[PDB]
Structure formats: C-alpha cells, structure tokens
Amino acid sequence: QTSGGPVDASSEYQQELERELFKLKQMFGNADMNTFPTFKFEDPKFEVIEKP
Amino acid sequence: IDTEKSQQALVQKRHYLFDVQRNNIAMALEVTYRERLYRVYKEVKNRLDYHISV
Amino acid sequence: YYKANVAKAGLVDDFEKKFNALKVPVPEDKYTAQVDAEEKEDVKSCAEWVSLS
Amino acid sequence: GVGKTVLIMELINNVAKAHGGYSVFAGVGERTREGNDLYHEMIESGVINLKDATSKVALVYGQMNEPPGARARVALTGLTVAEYFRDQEGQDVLLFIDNIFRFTQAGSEVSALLGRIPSAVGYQPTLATDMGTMQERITTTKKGSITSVQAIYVPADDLTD
Ligand SMILES: Nc1ncnc2c1ncn2[C@@H]1O[C@H](COP(=O)(O)OP(=O)(O)O)[C@@H](O)[C@H]1O
Ligand SMILES: [Mg+2]
Numbered sequence: 001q002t003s004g005g006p007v008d009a010s011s012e013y014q015q016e017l018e019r020e021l022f023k024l025k026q027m028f029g030n031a032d033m034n035t036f037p038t039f040k041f042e043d044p045k046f047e048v049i050e051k052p
Numbered sequence: 053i054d055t056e057k058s059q060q061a062l063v064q065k066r067h068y069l070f071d072v073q074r075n076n077i078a079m080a081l082e083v084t085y086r087e088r089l090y091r092v093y094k095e096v097k098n099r100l101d102y103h104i105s106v
Numbered sequence: 107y108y109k110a111n112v113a114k115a116g117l118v119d120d121f122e123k124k125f126n127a128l129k130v131p132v133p134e135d136k137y138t139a140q141v142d143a144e145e146k147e148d149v150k151s152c153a154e155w156v157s158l159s
Numbered sequence: 160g161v162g163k164t165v166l167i168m169e170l171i172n173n174v175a176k177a178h179g180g181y182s183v184f185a186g187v188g189e190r191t192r193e194g195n196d197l198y199h200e201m202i203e204s205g206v207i208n209l210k211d212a213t214s215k216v217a218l219v220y221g222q223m224n225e226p227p228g229a230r231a232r233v234a235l236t237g238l239t240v241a242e243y244f245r246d247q248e249g250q251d252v253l254l255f256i257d258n259i260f261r262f263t264q265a266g267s268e269v270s271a272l273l274g275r276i277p278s279a280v281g282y283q284p285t286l287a288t289d290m291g292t293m294q295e296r297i298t299t300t301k302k303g304s305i306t307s308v309q310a311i312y313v314p315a316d317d318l319t320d
Contacts, residue, residue: 019249021106023301028102034117036124037095041088044080046137049073050144056159063152070145074138081133088130096125103112 163310164193167257170308171197175206175216180251180304181244182206185237186220188230188261194220217244223261231265238296245303252305254297260312263290280320 002008025033112118175182186194201207201216208214217240221233234256241254263286270283278284297307314320 019302023249024106025102028098028105033099033102036121037099039092039130041131042084043133044084046077049141051148060156060159063156066148066152067145070141070148073141077135077138077141081135084133085130088133092128092130096121099121100108100112100118103114103117104108 163312164257167255167308167310168197168200171255172204174306175253176204178251178253179215180253181248182216182253182255183237183241183244184216184218184255185234185257186218186222187234187237187256187258188221188223188225188265189257191220191222191224194218194222227265227268230261231269234259234262234293238293241305241307242296245300245305249303251303254305254307255309256307257310258312259309260314262293 007013031037108118108122171182171184184197186197198207198218202209206214206216207218219233219237219240221229221236223230225233237254237256241252244250244252263282266283266286266289267281270285271277275284278286283289297305297309299305
C-alpha cells in the first residue's frame with residue numbers, strides 16, 4: 001500500500017540520503033551527471049623539424 | 053675512390069631522417085585519435101553506470 | 107545492460123542517440139606534406155653532390 | 160626528548176591553520192603544562208575563539224595525574240568526537256593524539272589488578288587486541304575522512320618494545 005508512498009511512510013532517512021547522494025555524486029564527478037557531456041578536443045603540438 | 057664511394061652509399065642512406073619524423077607524425081595522430089576514442093567512450097559509459105549506481 | 111537496468115525516463119535512449127550520431131574529430135595531418143617537400147629538396151641537394159663526387 | 164611534541168605542534172600549526180575541517184586534539188596521559196601551552200597558543204592563534212564561536216578545534220585532555228582508567232579512555236573520548244565530526248557531518252577531520260603509548264601503558268597499570276597473567280615485557284595479555292579495537296576506529300571511511308597524527312612514545316629508544 002504505497003500508492004502515494006514513495007518510500008512507504010518513512011518520515012525520515014532523507015536527512016542522510018542527501019548525504020549519500022552527495023558523496024556518491026561527488027565521487028563520480030562534479031558536473032551535472034544528468035545531462036549529456038559536451039566535448040572539447042585538443043590537437044598535439046609540433047615544432048620546426050626541417051633541417052635548420 | 054673507396055672513401056668517395058663510401059660517401060655515396062651514405063648519401064643514399066640519408067632518407068632515414070625523413071621517414072622517422074613521418075613515422076612520429078603518423079603515430080602521434082593515431083594516438084590522439086585513439087585517446088579521443090577511449091575518452092569519449094569511457095565518459096559516456098560513466099554517466100550510464102552512475103545512473104545504475106544511484 | 108543499460109536498456110533494462112535504468113528506471114530513468116528514457117534518458118538512456120538520448121545519450122545513446124547522441125552517441126551513435128556523434129562525430130569524433132579525426133585529426134588531420136597538417137605536418138607531413140611540409141616534411142615531404144623538405145625531403146624532395148634534400149634529395150636534390152644529395153643528387154647534385156653525388157654527381158660532383 | 161627527541162621532538163615528538165614540537166613536530167606535532169608544527170604539524171598543527173601548518174596543516175590545521177591551512178585546514179578547514181574541524182581539527183580535534185586528544186592529550187592522552189601527557190604533561191598538563193603542555194596542555195595549557197597548546198590551549199593558549201591556539202587561543203592566540205585564532206584557532207580557538209572564546210567569543211563569536213567560529214572555533215575549529217575540540218580539545219580532550221586526560222593527563223599524567225589521572226588514574227589509569229582515565230588515561231586509557233581519554234583516547235576513546237577524543238576518537239568519539241572526531242568520529243561524530245566524520246560521520247554525522249561528512250567533514251574532513253584532523254585527529255592529533257599525544258601520546259598514544261600512554262593509552263597502552265594505562266592498560267598495563269590495571270592488568271594484574273584485573274586478575275590477568277602478564278605477557279612479555281610486563282604488558283597486558285590483551286595488548287594487540289585493545290590497540291586494534293581502538294585504532295581501527297581511527298580511519299577514513301566512505302562517509303568521511305580522518306587524517307590522524309599520533310605521537311608514539313618509544314620507551315628507552317627501543318622500537319622493539
Ligand atoms: N624541531 C626542533 N627544533 C629545535 N629544538 C627542538 C626541536 N624538537 C625538539 N627540540 C628540542 O628537544 C627538546 C624536546 O622536545 P619535545 O617536543 O618535548 O620531545 P618529546 O615530545 O619527544 O618529549 C625540546 O625542548 C627542544 O629543546
Ligand atoms: Mg612530548
């Protein structure tokens with residue numbers, strides 16, 4: 001009997017759930033892990049190699 | 053004569069400098085590509101398992 | 107493994123739709139043509155010396 | 160006399176003033192003079208604030224003049240303060256303990272009076288397990304972090320005691 005019950009009449013466990021989800025999220029990353037990641041890409045460096 | 057012909061054999065060997073660099077230009081562009089592949093693959097996989105973890 | 111194990115509303119689909127339709131930038135050379143030209147120039151300087159020798 | 164207290168006070172100075180995570184100092188069977196010294200050099204350093212309570216260090220003290228029981232349990236008291244700061248707040252705690260040997264020594268001073276056959280070098284038969292159940296609580300978990308600096312007295316420069 002949990003129709004309106006997300007967690008079956010807890011009235012608690014949220015005060016630590018916020019901490020667990022903070023820790024779990026902060027150890028997986030720091031950005032928003034609910035959206036797709038954009039990609040910036042670099043190009044290797046090069047120098048003058050021909051005979052000076 | 054023997055000294056001069058030795059120099060010619062050496063001149064003919066000169067080409068090894070240019071292929072070496074060409075090899076390094078070849079491999080580097082191959083590396084940065086494969087890194088770009090693993091980076092993109094691994095990141096998107098991370099967001100997936102995070103949903104699985106939470 | 108990710109179709110049948112995420113209860114989030116269709117978010118696994120658009121991540122994978124964004125993936126198969128992702129174009130990773132293949133790096134272009136921009137650096138071997140100019141060493142080939144230097145190679146050509148060298149063989150010129152080589153061959154003329156072999157002629158002198 | 161080799162410099163454990165000076166080194167632990169320099170570590171306090173550097174790290175704790177560079178830290179933002181509620182340090183905790185536990186004086187375990189040490190000199191009371193050094194306790195007063197540390198208290199006042201922490202007040203004058205701003206780390207302890209007697210007004211406008213933004214203090215960042217909790218002090219727990221049981222010194223040489225205490226009975227064996229107090230000197231055996233004061234390390235646990237300081238440990239419990241640090242453990243609350245780690246678990247119920249997720250903060251990153253510093254835990255300075257000086258001296259931890261006294262903890263061990265305190266046990267010895269009651270061992271035979273509890274009716275226990277002495278072990279080697281006159282130490283309680285329960286030395287390793289007592290040290291284990293105390294030290295295994297001083298640890299970083301997935302819920303928080305505890306950096307612990309413990310001054311360990313080595314009797315007579317033995318290191319094999
Ligand atoms: N870093 C140091 N610099 C200068 N003198 C020191 C230093 N450390 C120790 N000493 C000297 O050795 C003495 C003993 O220092 P102390 O911290 O009480 O050692 P312990 O804690 O092992 O008994 C000090 O009074 C001091 O004169
Ligand atoms: Mg000392």
